[PDB]
Design a binder for this molecule. Structure first.
Ligand code: HEM
Ligand code: HEM
Ligand SMILES: [Cl-]
Ligand SMILES: [Cl-]
Ligand SMILES: [Cl-]
Lengths: 300, 302
């Protein structure tokens, strides 16, 4: 062992959340978090991101990638997310990945105008920046600490500034973590039109998670986990159904206990998950190097 | 298309006669709610128990080396037999022909190293398996096997005993009840077994197979707490496994309690046993490949 059994909490406490926001987000989102939890977040996220009809149409009907190749879509998305999370928006390795995502979105926008308003870039990024926070609160665990919240804000405000939308690069971002939460909650309270494309996509997204981590007879358990964590508003909008009240209390407690065990009790990891992944003989699919492009709009 | 009611397994046991239908009751106890993960957990807890006698850890760890050098294959190969026995029971030719193969294996091993397969150890090992889920449940704060499950488990393993070869002959004189099986297991585990390096080496390779299969990379620590929380204090000391972190132990035992509660009491019962489910998959899962068999020499009588 190179490090003390407990060092992550302490190292965050030592850092400045206004300067070291990249490092704090990395410590928050890439050490205790593994491929399973990161997949859980993506699974909860895509149906949130696609509350606008044009988004569920785009993914579910137009490209079909989530429906016909759900596993590849999940792996492809996460290759980018892990890279961003490891290095942050000031780093060229993350920026060149984002440049590729911007190029993808730009071509999609020509196929279907109105799919990429800045509103949705703010929402999606804000969702991700508060995701683990909200998941923890749903499981009865404490929210992110003061420094984690401030860092998460600066991290996502930073990525916002280099994130393309049909309204241009996202210059005017929520002002604080609390402002990100309120944006996400306000957006989720909007009167989105309910559409069959949303149901179809939500189901394909859910099934990817089940197929990866809860195969065969385990499906039912995995379903309770997702339906226990997905917001009531998004479940209704996408016809996902509702958790069994008894199962929900149990699965949330099990998630609570697992996170408690790895955070408070068992030794902290010495390396981030991406680092661990790059030591494996075969590169795990979520940790393959994302495709990159020319950096057009550099971080300021 | 649900074919069965959400809850039918408990009720089916309740309708059965544990003195006649013991094979079916054991099947309902050990092959529906149990999956490959839990079955692997039972194997992992079992081998170091079975090898408390030095000659057993020597045989597996030094002589054949299979559990040390090919742990995953050993686990799969053992469980192919266990699932088959559990699905059909000792009165069934399919299980008998598998056991005949295991008897042949043990017979050749016993010639290589006499004293490795006394009736004592066949009784202990089979009794350990017959009370394994019972003890695991009690360790996790759940109720033990029900009246009929206990009776059936006894008859099941008494039956297998009668066709199980040992160096003292086929095991005719078996513990007389579930309670007697539990006391035999407890008495054996209280014995003053000689502590030997072969035991440490084997116990650690057994543990590592489980970690490698279900708790890879950073998950290992969690997997270790699970095993060390369930393994008996006596066997941990004997095999230098160490002791669980008291905080982690309480957490992992509650998580196991809750998972079993969820699948048993809350979520719909499975419609098919795990072997049945397994035989529907495009590729046969390794635990559920049909075991190697031999000619039935000593047929079940009862
Ligand atoms: C909100 C509206 C958005 C829509 C409708 C959308 C849709 C898509 C589509 C259609 C793809 C191509 C793969 C496919 O056919 O499914 C894609 C790729 C991607 N998007 Fe978005 N996106 C949106 C916003 C965002 C945001 C805000 C992020 C990140 C913060 C993001 C991250 C990605 C990544 C990393 C990929 C690459 C995945 C792959 O190559 O399959 N998207 N998106
Ligand atoms: C009492 C001491 C026992 C010892 C030392 C022992 C040892 C062994 C050995 C060495 C093998 C061959 C595979 C290897 O190289 O590891 C084997 C096979 C097997 N034994 Fe035993 N055994 C014992 C008792 C039992 C009992 C009581 C059962 C079941 C109730 C059992 C079930 C099996 C099965 C299913 C196999 C086949 C696994 C394979 O082919 O890899 N053993 N045993
Ligand atoms: Cl953070
Ligand atoms: Cl299954
Ligand atoms: Cl890892």
């Amino acid at each position: 062992r190179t490090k003390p059994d407990k060092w992550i909490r302490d190292e965050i406490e030592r850092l400045d959340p206004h300067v070291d926001y990249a490092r704090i987000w990395q410590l928050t989102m890439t050490y205790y978090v593994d491929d399973f939890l990161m997949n859980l977040i993506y699974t909860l996220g895509i149906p949130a991101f696609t509350q606008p009809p044009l988004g569920s149409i785009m993914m579910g009907q137009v490209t079909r990638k989530a429906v016909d190749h759900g596993q590849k879509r999940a792996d492809d998305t996460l290759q980018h997310f892990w890279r961003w999370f490891e290095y942050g928006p000031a780093d060229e390795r993350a920026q060149a990945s984002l440049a590729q995502v911007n190029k993808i979105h730009q071509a999609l926008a020509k196929r279907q105008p109105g799919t990429f308003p800045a509103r949705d870039v703010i929402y999606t990024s804000s969702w991700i920046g508060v995701a683990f926070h909200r998941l923890r609160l749903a499981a009865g665990l404490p929210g992110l600490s003061d420094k984690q919240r401030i860092a998460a804000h600066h991290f996502w405000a930073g990525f916002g500034s280099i994130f393309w939308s049909e309204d241009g690069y996202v210059t005017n971002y929520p002002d604080s973590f609390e402002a990100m939460l309120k944006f996400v909650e306000d957006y989720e309270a909007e009167d989105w039109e309910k559409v069959e494309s949303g149901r179809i996509l939500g189901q394909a997204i859910n099934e990817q998670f089940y197929d990866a981590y809860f195969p065969g007879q385990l499906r039912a358990l995995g379903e309770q986990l997702v339906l226990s964590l997905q917001t009531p508003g998004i479940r209704r909008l996408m016809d996902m159904g509702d958790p069994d009240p008894q199962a929900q209390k149990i699965v949330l407690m099990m998630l609570n206990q697992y996170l408690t065990l790895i955070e408070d009790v068992l030794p902290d990891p010495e390396l981030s998950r991406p680092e661990r992944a790059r030591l494996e003989g075969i590169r795990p699919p979520q940790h393959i190097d994302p495709p990159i492009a020319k950096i057009l709009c550099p971080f300021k």
